[PDB]
Amino acid sequence: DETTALVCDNGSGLVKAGFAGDDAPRAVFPSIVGRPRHQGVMVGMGQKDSYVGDEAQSKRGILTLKYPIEHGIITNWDDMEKIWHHTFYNELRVAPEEHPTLLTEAPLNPKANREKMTQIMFETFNVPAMYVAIQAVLSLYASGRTTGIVLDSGDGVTHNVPIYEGYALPHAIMRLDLAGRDLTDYLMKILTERGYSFVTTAEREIVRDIKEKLCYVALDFENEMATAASSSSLEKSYELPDGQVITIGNERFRCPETLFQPSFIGMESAGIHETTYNSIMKCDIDIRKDLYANNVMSGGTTMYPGIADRMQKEITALAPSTMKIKIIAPPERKYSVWIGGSILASLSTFQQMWITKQEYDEAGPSIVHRKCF
Amino acid sequence: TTALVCDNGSGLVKAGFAGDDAPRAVFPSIVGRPRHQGVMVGMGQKDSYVGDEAQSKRGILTLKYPIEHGIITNWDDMEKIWHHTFYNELRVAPEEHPTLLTEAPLNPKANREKMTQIMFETFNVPAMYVAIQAVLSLYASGRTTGIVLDSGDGVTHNVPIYEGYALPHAIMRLDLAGRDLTDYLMKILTERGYSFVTTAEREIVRDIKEKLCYVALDFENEMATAASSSSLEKSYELPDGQVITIGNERFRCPETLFQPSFIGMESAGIHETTYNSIMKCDIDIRKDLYANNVMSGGTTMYPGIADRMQKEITALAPSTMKIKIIAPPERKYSVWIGGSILASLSTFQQMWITKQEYDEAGPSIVHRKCF
Amino acid sequence: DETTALVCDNGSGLVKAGFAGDDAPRAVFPSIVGRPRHQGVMVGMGQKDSYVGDEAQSKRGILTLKYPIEHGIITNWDDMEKIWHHTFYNELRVAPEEHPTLLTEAPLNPKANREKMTQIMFETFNVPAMYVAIQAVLSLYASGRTTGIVLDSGDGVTHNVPIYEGYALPHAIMRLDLAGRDLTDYLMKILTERGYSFVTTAEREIVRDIKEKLCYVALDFENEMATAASSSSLEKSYELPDGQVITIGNERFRCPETLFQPSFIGMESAGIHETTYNSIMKCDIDIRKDLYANNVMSGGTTMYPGIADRMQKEITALAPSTMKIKIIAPPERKYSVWIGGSILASLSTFQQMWITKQEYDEAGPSIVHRKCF
Amino acid sequence: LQKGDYVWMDLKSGQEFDVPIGAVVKLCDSGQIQAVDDEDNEHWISPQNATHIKPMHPTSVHGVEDMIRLGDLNEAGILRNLLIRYRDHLIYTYTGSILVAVNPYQLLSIYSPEHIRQYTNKKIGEMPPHIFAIADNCYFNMKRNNRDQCCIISGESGAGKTESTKLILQFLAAISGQHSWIEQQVLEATPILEAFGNAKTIRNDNSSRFGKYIDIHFNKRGAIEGAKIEQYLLEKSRVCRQAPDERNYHVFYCMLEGMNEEEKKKLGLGQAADYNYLAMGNCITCEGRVDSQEYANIRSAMKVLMFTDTENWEISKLLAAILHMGNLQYEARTFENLDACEVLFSPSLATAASLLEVNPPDLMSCLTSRTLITRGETVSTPLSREQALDVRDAFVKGIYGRLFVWIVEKINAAIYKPPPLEVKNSRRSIGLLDIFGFENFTVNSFEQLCINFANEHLQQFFVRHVFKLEQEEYDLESIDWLHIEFTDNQEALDMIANRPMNVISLIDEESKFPKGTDATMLHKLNSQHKLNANYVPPKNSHETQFGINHFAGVVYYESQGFLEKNRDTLHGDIIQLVHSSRNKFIKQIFQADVAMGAETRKRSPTLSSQFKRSLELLMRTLGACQPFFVRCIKPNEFKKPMLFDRHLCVRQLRYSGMMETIRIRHAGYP
């Protein structure tokens, strides 16, 4: 009777899991699987051939870390099973065969991804029911709105989905593959100018931590260049795990800048501001004002200081002067996708939209295409 | 059938049974032969003397070490030493007891293959195994993480280990050891007028080293104190009755460990070697390595060596870091204790090289199985 | 008027110097500085506190040799000054104050190295002009092409730079720190398995000579090992400078194999073949067909007898079966960087891109960042 | 379909131990069995659920002494047969060759000198079941085949195991002509041995923690020439650690209260709450006994067994020293980048040294240091805080174990009467073994694992004996049996202690392995035994329980507690301190140890190693003798003369292993 549903927002970098109804995710941990790369010499030591999640970042210096999901597409279908097993048994401590599960996905992904997710859920873990939903839609549920264009940016993909009164405009959906992982790689590349060298997958985590703790979005890129070149006030220090101290200057705001100028990492695509403006323009003329008044930002990549201010500045420059540009950046936007998923899964109206085991048994893995979205 | 742990060191032989606190037999690894003329007919005549009786009859014999710098030079003498260990010291038949042996990390493969062949054919052991000494030192220290500085009579080597995973690229070896320290003491004693040449006199100088040598924290200050006062001088009585007084030699002899340029070697000191081994390891690993500088071997028993190592490594390392030099009081037998623990483990019982495997594969089986 | 320029390809192991317009370098000597480590007893003998170049090899037995350049980065700015002084005066017989100088540098080096080179050249040797170039571009210049991906491998660094029709793709540039120095150090570690012990910095050159004279690359590593473990056809003999004879077997092809398997020395990176394939696949889809057939190999580390066949086999296995893989290994690739530098410095259109003394005086040492690359 | 019949009515109750009750049929409408299920219950059975009704076989209808010939050979039938006999004051029943006795909780009159002679020279089945009958046939077969016999008494604690041992000895006393003063001594030995060998558990106030064997030696054509008491499988982890709602051995409590105050003052004793070795169980007083009365019983029994007042004072001091060492407190120290200890000052430390008659500096160094004693030097090594607690507890357990052996030796000296062995026919012994039974508590620990491991050997010994007398015997005379399967169950034993990579050694290996924890031990067990069907791995990583499929069923053991109980570390310094002690008694009980000289103390046989060797010695003794099996069942938990709890009983039937006899019947010719 009172069978609580499961919401598993399995992103490219972090896995968010919990129960439908809770305020915050129960388990958050990196989506990595590590394997030993050295020689084991002590006989009788605990021999594990795989480390998943937080356990793989504690024994991080003797492992090779591999993300099973890149750009929102699952490339390794055994590491992903390992991660799902960890999430279900070792993190949530629940039996997968007695809880309906809700999964999230990027807007434009290959259909094979959804089909294999369906097959794995219904044949390996034997879930009673399943549903796959768009993260950008769940962001609106979290924000408590029915109208607005949402800018979701994790570390695999960045996408915009405009919605008006619960109606989505598919032709105005945009998808970019520039995200937090590319930001980390660009920072790791530009750190070599000062002398610091990070190559290993273990050092990639250190670079990501430096990015998260020191990087910010500059409102005026040229002036911030001038200030950084003329003074050391913008310089900050960070201590490496071995005790060495590094100092970074203009990199703090050069690294996040690639969001607005993707040409830095060699991409021809436009910035997030231009992408959002084009997505708004693709919609109907009447919808545009309400879309301007409601810009919802979600994802970890949107957590840089000043990103909302610069986004408002750029969209104000692009948009007509009469229109009022409002950037909605909730403080908990890092978990808005999961919160919206929980709200959606906790609705009575949603309980007849689950894909049940009988329908899968009679239709095959293609039932998800006609049921979910 | 209790396993036998035999730590065939360059200087001393530590032997015993697995699952014991301390080595059963600890005797020097020398083979002495008469160097004079036998005039009394009927006196018991022995071609060779091995170990304690060789030391006892040091006057009329010439002493030779079968093992030099960890490599077995004279296999006939080494076989004699193994026979003495098996039958005279431990009083155990080798054919009924598995035997565990130790070896330096970077010895030639021929040494290991020949040891395997001798064990399986000359002594016909049921099984045998060769292990690295630093891993056994960690086993004795009761840790699964840390960098081990094992210095004996032949070689000095560092092996960094984390959670049981060794980093072979960071393993370093150095040939400076107690034998070189003894020779350097023999050389520097000539400045005071004392002359030691014969191998027996070399053993006497080794005794003098072990009794009077120590490590000074500040070499220049210690030199100044020795030059300005006679407080550091100490007296030692030779077997014939003569007494010798030595001054700055006490701390000059161990200092060659930190300044290998004294004996004319270009290699870096032990502290710099440890620091380089730590730096070669991954950045996440370095903190646990710095906090777990395990020490083993007889050559690390000089007074103040732990303090000097801590000072040098602290100077080299970043200030935020915590440098801890772990020197157990029983570090001379830590390798044997670790070998006993390893042989006692039930998990290790599946990793012995059985006689059938040797009969099939040949002596090359040891590289496939051990390490 | 007719002021010939100077090309100084100061690598990590060798210094190649000469004049613009020449065919081959005029001065090729090791980049070391030697100092005595013993006690001088004979009063009257001329005492030198430093030996640079070939004299440090002639007096190798009583000196400590120190490379001032490691992994392409200059670490000893006094030893580097001594080497540059020796190159200018004692090897070239030319005053540096009246000749423009062209220098080479790794693509992804720290930005302080270039500035320090600029300051040293413009304040110590008083050169009238200067330029710093990238070695892969000069390798293409020597090879006489405009489209191709260059795999340069000296003994400091190994880097890949793809170029199409004179345009470089900076985001596809790969740098990897595994070269002849690491190969020598690995041979010096695997040579102890037979009883040979080289620990001295003077005995490092003997191991380097052994590697240069007896090491090749196997087409099939496992088959080569199986052959070497079944006969004595692969064994060769080398005589030490004191008459001792040493024999090596599978160490001949086990040393160069670490280029394709960096895990041998404990590195997590990928082999040179996979690095080249990734660099090619990081480019535009229209460029890959013309890059697969223009793999230009440069550097001294690519002189092994059989590397061009192994690399072709690996890239053919990695690439689609409809592309033609062609590895271009010129017989003179050991001097390709210098030849290309001479060709570039001899160009008439290049004379407007020199960093003049007035520009340096006006803009400080930072002029080089905007004048070069 | 008739009325008033007996029909097996099968309730669908969710309790784990539920079997059909059956009831007499009443009235006529629908099912309407009722008329008491077996006590008073009503069941308005409908026609739809009439499938719960199965007609009952006449042999099951009336209680049959031999359960082997029972019509419905099922747990429900066997449970029921006990029930009519118990309600009729019959507390004995056969299962072919196994007696089943139900503790009456009342003094019944089935035992009398008339009953002795009445059952004398009577084979099994000649008379109603009786504990005398097992004793008589055991005595008769003894001289008939000139082979030593053994009787095994086992069951749940408080089911009458000890009493049945007394009654069997009483019968064997009377079958001999002389009164045989030995038995009176054996009864006198019971209060002393039970005092030092039993303790209170959550289930029973007096629970046996070891195996008792009484080797009553029989002379040629005679009886009670001599008797020897030998103890096995003594639980020693309890001396230092007690589970919640459980308390240490009764000796410490009986000694601490009910003694002259001046005697306490000399020993330094106070109350019982002060000592952690007696108060961590949080139950000092056990309702239903006045331990002071037991102290008089203990001392008086000692006086009969030639225990002089000097000996008891020697014993009391050692027990006094145990309690004071228990209250010693250790504090962590860092020394010089190492692990060091510091025993906080307390009157217990000074009192312990005085009681042990050792130098206080010597006691301090021995508790907080270890010496290598290699050839040529000594070398002292500091101990960590966890290691210091280990050597302290090992010393405490060492004293109590050796003290227990001495008491058994002293009792043995007065009753053994060494038989003249110059004749080849030495004597024909009849061993009586009083052993614990299988338990499956809510929380099972290291103690339960060794206890459950022991019954695996006993059950295998029991199964083989039954199998031999099964179609292997009674078919062998007439009917073919080779087609019939007689497989054994050694897979469980092989996984536990009889194969490489067995469970016990993995516990021993993890005890000494560097940085060893209970979590790491569980991972070793999971990695090695995941594929084995007998092993049930924990479902999650956070779960700390592993399941082992014993013969009775799957039993889950808590990983926490291991690697702490299974560490009996006695260094050489401990024996050195004992040898130098002024007290002669402490040196006397360590007599084998004070002849030291072995560095094999790295072995220091752990509680697992000692338990196995004791079990192997026990099994060899039973192996040499032909076995007779007796099962004792407690009908109810609240002691009442007539109350038969079904769920409690059937649990004991399943865990006893008696059901294997019934199973092999079905495989053969039922």
Ligand SMILES: Nc1ncnc2c1ncn2[C@@H]1O[C@H](COP(=O)(O)OP(=O)(O)O)[C@@H](O)[C@H]1O
């Ligand atoms: N405080 C922060 N500042 C900047 N970036 C952040 C911050 N916290 C997280 N990130 C980035 O967000 C990325 C993933 O975040 P998130 O969107 O929660 O996961 P997912 O991509 O699975 O949705 C990480 O790669 C990280 O670089």
Ligand SMILES: Nc1ncnc2c1ncn2[C@@H]1O[C@H](COP(=O)(O)OP(=O)(O)O)[C@@H](O)[C@H]1O
């Ligand atoms: N107290 C001491 N002080 C200094 N050196 C010592 C001391 N005791 C032993 N040594 C040195 O230790 C060396 C041998 O120690 P050991 O480790 O047993 O040798 P091996 O490593 O060859 O087995 C001897 O050469 C001796 O010089």
Ligand SMILES: Nc1ncnc2c1ncn2[C@@H]1O[C@H](COP(=O)(O)OP(=O)(O)O)[C@@H](O)[C@H]1O
């Ligand atoms: N024939 C050869 N075979 C193998 N390696 C070689 C050969 N010739 C030169 N090398 C290696 O090339 C390295 C330096 O060559 P070079 O490309 O001139 O270096 P750099 O580019 O740093 O000046 C040396 O370390 C040497 O080991």
Ligand SMILES: Nc1ncnc2c1ncn2[C@@H]1O[C@H](COP(=O)(O)OP(=O)(O)O)[C@@H](O)[C@H]1O
């Ligand atoms: N056959 C019996 N007749 C009378 N009382 C009995 C009988 N068996 C057990 N009891 C009662 O049970 C109580 C405890 O039984 P005991 O045999 O001591 O338990 P355990 O088997 O645990 O030692 C005794 O007080 C005794 O009165």
Ligand SMILES: [Mg+2]
């Ligand atoms: Mg997301």
Ligand SMILES: [Mg+2]
């Ligand atoms: Mg040694």
Ligand SMILES: [Mg+2]
């Ligand atoms: Mg080069």
Ligand SMILES: [Mg+2]
């Ligand atoms: Mg009892």
